[PDB]
Design a binder for this molecule. Structure first.
Ligand SMILES: Cc1cc2nc3c(=O)[nH]c(=O)nc-3n(C[C@H](O)[C@H](O)[C@H](O)COP(=O)(O)O)c2cc1C
Ligand SMILES: [Cl-]
Ligand SMILES: [Mg+2]
Ligand SMILES: [Mg+2]
Length: 135
């Protein structure tokens, strides 16, 4: 199960915000989210299980950030981005996402793991400027 991964246990010891998705199910829904993620976003565990985590995005989310994630997942690459997300009540926050594939012995992706960090406006600005300049 989700909490059987040693890196998941490690993240829990530090109370990180993370989710686990299941890409064997159509549209790669969330199948676990940590308490920090639920408090951050305003959703109960049962309500987020079964949703693709794109439910956190909205009209002011930059589609280029989303596309970078999409392509990373497609290309088998670790991906790190900052993008605007939305709580259940419509309020917004900047979210730094760290996404990786969890793989079996033959390389098959068995789950994805995504760590989330709420960051300040100032930090999001600095990060996105660096990302751009580095491009
Ligand atoms: C493990 C995992 C965790 C994710 N965490 C979130 C997140 O907190 N917020 C968000 O906007 N997208 C997150 N995503 C990204 C969306 O689920 C989706 O991959 C992204 O929108 C790109 O796919 P799409 O272009 O089909 O929407 C996560 C994705 C994965 C695989
Ligand atoms: Cl996805
Ligand atoms: Mg329902
Ligand atoms: Mg559900």
């Amino acid at each position: 199960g989700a909490m059987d991964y040693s890196l998941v246990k490690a993240l829990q010891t530090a109370q990180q915000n993370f989710v686990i998705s299941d890409p064997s199910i159509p549209d790669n829904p969330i199948v676990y989210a940590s308490q920090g993620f639920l408090t951050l976003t305003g959703y109960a565990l049962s309500e987020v299980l079964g949703r693709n985590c794109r439910f956190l995005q909205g009209p002011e989310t930059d589609p280029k950030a989303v596309e970078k994630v999409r392509k990373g997942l497609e290309r088998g690459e670790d991906t790190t981005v900052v993008l605007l997300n939305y709580r259940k009540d419509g309020s917004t926050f900047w979210n730094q996402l760290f996404i990786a594939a969890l793989r079996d012995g033959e390389g098959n992706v068995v789950n994805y793991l995504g760590v989330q960090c709420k960051v300040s406006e100032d930090y999001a600005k600095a990060f996105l400027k660096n990302e751009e300049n580095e491009k």
